[PDB]
Structure formats: C-alpha cells, structure tokens
C-alpha cells in the first residue's frame, strides 16, 4: 500500500494508548513491571477491587492482559521498533519469575489476581482462591518464547488440575493451587468414547461437566504444547487434544449434523431441588427439567444452541479450531468446522433479515415463546427473540473458514451477513469486485478483522479502502481520554481492549506483514467474587460499566 498521513495517525493513537498504559498502569506505591488491568480515565489511577469490609486492592490479573501483550508484539512488527516486544518480555518474565504456584498454575484468572501495590495474592471470592479460565485463550507462543519451561509446566498443570475424570472428561472450573504437578499427565492412554450414537440426542450421563466453554481452552492448550515444545516434553498432548475435540463432534445431532454445546449430561444424583430455580446440576439435566415436558428427548443441555451457547460454538470455539486447522495444516479439523458452521446456519439463520433463531440442535425453534416455567435458561415468561449480533463477530469464522476451504455456501452466507451489516455488496462470488459502503458508521474491531480476511481472500483493494475508512471511524468513536472505550461515558478503561490489535493488524496488512501479527482468537477475561455490597459480582459490570 501507498501509505498516508491518516494511516500514520491511527498508529499514533495506538502508540499513545500504549504509552498511557505503560505509565498510568504502573503502581506509584511499589513500582515493578506488573500492569494494572484497568485505568480510571478521570483520575488516571489503576482500578481497584473493593471488598465487602471496604478494603481496596489495585488489580493486576495477567489473564486479562493477554491482548495487550499481543498489541505490544504487533506494534514492534509494524514499526520495526523492538522496544515494544521487549517491554512485553520484561512484564511477562517478571510475572513468570514471581507469580506461579508450586504446581505450575499461574496466579491469575476468574478468582485470583495480584495486588499491584503490595504484590500479595488476592482472592476476590471468599474461600474460593482457585485457578479459573473460561475461553481465555492465553498468548501461548509468546509465553513459550519468554519461558518455555514454565509454559510447558503451566499447560500440564492446567489439564492436571481441571480434568476430574480421565474417562468421562468431566472438567472442573475451579482448579486447585494444591493439586500436585504431574509431568506425565498426557502419557495416559486415550480411552473409548462414551458417546453412543444410536441414543443421540440423549447423551451419556456423568457429572455433565463437558461445556465447550471449558473444553475449548483445554484443547487449545494441549495443541499449543504439541506445537511449541520438543517431542518428548509434549508426548501425548496432541492425542488428548484430539480426543477431547472429537467428543463434541461425535455428539452432534444425528439427523441435522448441527454442533452441540457439550457431549454429556449431568446425572440426577440428589433430590429434591428447593424449587424450579434451584438449578444445581446434581438434580439432573437442566434442559430436561425446564423444557423436557413439552419438547421430549431433544431437551438435554448439549442440544441447547441459544442463551449464548451458539456464540461459544460458532464464534469462540470455531475460531480456535480454524486457527489449529491452519497452524497444523489439518484438513480433518477444517472440514469438521466447516460442516458444523454450515449445519448450524442451515437451521438457525434467517437470510431475509440476518438474524439467528434460538434453536435446539434438531432445528426446533423457541423463537417468541415465553418459557413455561423457571429454570436454568431463564425465569418463567422469558422470551428469546431471533438475535442479530451488534458487530460482525459471527462473520469472522465464516470468512476464515472460506479462506481455508472455498465453499460457495459460506460465500453466500458471508455476502448475506455483510449486506445486513450495512457493508454494501461483496458480489456473487470471490472473483467479483465488491461495491462497499465507505460511509458505514457502525464499525467495530470485527469490521476490520473481517475486511482484512476478505482482502486476503479476494486480493481486492476495495476491502482496504473500506477498512481504512472504518478504522478512522473506529479511532474517532472509541479512542477517548487516551484509552479505548466501548462507550465514551464509561469511566474505566480495560487494557485488554482489542481495538489496538485490530488497528495494528490493518497497519500490518498495509505494510504487507499480516501473517506476522498475533492472530485474534476471541479470548477475554473477567474477575468474579464479592464486590462491596454485592455478593455475586463481576469486574465487567462493577468496574468497566461505571459511568464518569
């Protein structure tokens, strides 16, 4: 590309943000390489967890900063200036030198973080100081670069602490910092599948702890161990990643091929529940409780594709599986992803308006129907409407899949989605020259990642014109008081914002370096515990949605 002052000014927004984070996100009380998770944009101070007793702790949670690591390494790629990547190394090396448990687990995640001012460990949730991830997708290749031994031990410790049962693959969410490390964790032999295909859509009963928003990080980690580490150190890891990934595929709906959210249901192990609102899985499968009376055998938890279950399948885990297919040059991973996306959208997508219907994996829709009773999926009277996400999240996997396997039905779905997002016309196939909307005013980071994929696909410079105009609007709307904010009324900025990565990926593409930047994988973080007066609280709301 012929580069312009406007392109440079977007890189300078990102450089300003980085400078702000590295300054304002450092404690004045005790200065170390650690970073704050978030910055108050009025005071310029790092954000705080407030405990019920009123004590405050400044938050440093390395699980919520992986996207900032990716922006630092991206900035060194696009600028050819090594100082950004070197500062990412400095932060990372200090964290890994100091804040790993004896068993190899990091002190980070949903229920653990480091006090930025005192360097003490913090447990936002009383009596639950545990290791918790949930579609976090850490920046493994860079962590491996900084400290390969600690990164190998981490992945082995993550599997060892969260896999409760090596035959059912029940996965606990709350990993113990007292669990013993086992260097030979992946040397266990691969067991048979529990999935009996002639019984689907009914699935095997175990503890039912096989949700894809637990399985996906485990699969990702095992495959990155295989990819990154020597043979001997990584023995067994790709096989165990493959087994776990395959269990989801084996449990797909036997008539529609639609993907599922999990591959086992919870046994009814205790009785009685206190009421319909008591949704502990020990009372049995929650979908069968809430929907079973009207819907029958389809009503089991893995077959529910609404209430954001579809997002974890067709967005988060789809991006991971596509990334692994491409990394490993693995056509079987690829065809299975493509088949899953196609079979989901044939049942759920409405091409007249671009919406996604709330469905079960056999195609039964509950669109518009008030829930008949309370339960895990909502109170009685809740209504699920067909949804069209605010931004092009669901588009990105369809474009990445197309770039790997040119299926014309993926192309038709992407053209229809972009049409309803206001992009204009991609045209009838990937050889068309598109007619794109250069005044599109609702833009997001997903606009830029998607436009870049379509440029890599089609080589049509129109997509770069479109992305440049969108990126200028993105900076104009979200770069506010020196940080990136989803709404200019918000008080507190998270340093895990993805606008910087999206902006730098576009800059890389203008400089012919796209392949060199960390790919966006949809990982994100949160902290959950008791916040001031509120028992069941997330930083997402208690901090990052506060208004100035």
């Amino acid at each position: 590309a012929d580069y312009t002052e406007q392109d440079a000014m977007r890189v300078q927004a990102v450089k300003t943000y980085i400078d702000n984070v590295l300054q304002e996100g450092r404690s004045q009380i005790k200065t170390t390489p650690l970073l704050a998770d978030g910055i108050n944009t009025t005071t310029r101070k790092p954000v705080e967890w407030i405990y019920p007793d009123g004590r405050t702790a400044t938050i440093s949670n390395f699980a919520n900063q992986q996207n900032f690591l990716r922006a630092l390494t991206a900035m060194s790629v696009v600028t050819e200036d090594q100082r950004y990547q070197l500062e990412a190394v400095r932060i990372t090396r200090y964290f890994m030198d100091n804040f790993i448990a004896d068993n190899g687990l990091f002190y980070w995640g949903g229920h653990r973080f480091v006090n930025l001012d005192t360097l003490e460990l913090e447990g936002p949730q009383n009596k639950n100081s545990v290791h918790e991830l949930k579609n976090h997708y850490p920046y493994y290749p860079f962590l491996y670069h900084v400290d390969p031994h600690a990164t190998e031990r981490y992945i082995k410790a993550f599997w060892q602490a969260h896999v409760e049962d090596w035959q059912s693959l029940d996965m606990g969410r709350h990993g113990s910092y007292s669990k013993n490390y086992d260097d030979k964790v992946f040397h266990r032999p691969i067991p048979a599948s529990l999935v009996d295909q002639s019984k689907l859509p009914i699935m095997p009963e175990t503890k039912g702890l096989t949700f894809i928003n637990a399985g996906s990080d485990l699969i990702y980690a095992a495959y990155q161990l295989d990819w990154l580490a020597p043979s001997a150190n990584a023995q067994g890891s790709a096989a165990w990643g493959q087994y776990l990934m395959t269990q989801y595929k084996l449990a797909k709906h036997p008539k529609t091929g639609a993907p599922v959210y999990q591959f086992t249901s919870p046994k009814k192990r205790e009785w009685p529940p206190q009421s319909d609102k008591d949704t502990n899985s020990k009372y049995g499968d929650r979908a069968a409780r809430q929907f079973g009376p009207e819907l029958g055998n389809i009503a089991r938890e893995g077959n529910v594709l609404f209430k954001s279950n579809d997002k974890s399948i067709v967005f988060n885990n789809a991006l991971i599986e596509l990334h692994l297919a491409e990394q490993r040059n693995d056509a079987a991973i690829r065809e299975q992803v493509v088949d899953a996306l196609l079979n989901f959208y044939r049942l759920a997508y409405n091409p007249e308006n671009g919406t996604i219907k709330p469905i079960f994996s056999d195609g039964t829709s509950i669109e518009g129907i008030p829930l008949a009773r309370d339960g895990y999926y909502g109170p009685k009277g809740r209504v699920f409407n067909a949804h069209k996400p605010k931004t092009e999240e669901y588009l990105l996997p369809i474009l990445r899949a197309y770039r790997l396997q040119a299926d014309p039905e993926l192309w038709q779905l992407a053209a229809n989605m972009t049409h309803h997002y206001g992009w204009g016309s991609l045209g009838n196939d990937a050889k068309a020259k598109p007619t794109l909307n250069m005044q599109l005013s609702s833009v997001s980071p997903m606009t830029l990642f998607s436009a870049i994929e379509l440029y890599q696909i089609t080589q049509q410079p129109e997509y770069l014109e479109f992305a440049r105009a969108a990126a200028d609007k993105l900076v104009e709307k979200r770069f506010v008081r020196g940080y990136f904010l989803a709404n200019p009324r918000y008080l507190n900025a998270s340093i895990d914002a993805i606008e910087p990565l999206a902006l730098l990926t576009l800059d890389a593409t203008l400089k012919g370096k796209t392949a060199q930047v960390a790919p966006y994988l949809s990982g994100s973080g949160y902290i959950h515990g008791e916040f001031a007066g509120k028992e069941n609280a997330y930083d997402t709301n208690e901090i990052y949605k506060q208004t100035r």
């Binding site: 949730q125 009383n126 639950n128 709350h174 954001s308 974890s312 996400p389 997330y538 709301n541």
Partner: peptide
C-alpha cells in the same frame, strides 16, 4: 464456593448483551 455459582454462557455481563 463457599458461595455457589454457575459458569454458563452469557453469564459474564458484557456490554455486547441485549
């Protein structure tokens, strides 16, 4: 634990939620 909670999809209250 000791305050029991789920980890369902859609539970963490992102700004993207309707």
């Amino acid at each position: 634990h000791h305050h029991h909670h789920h980890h369902s999809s859609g539970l963490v209250p992102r700004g993207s939620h309707a």
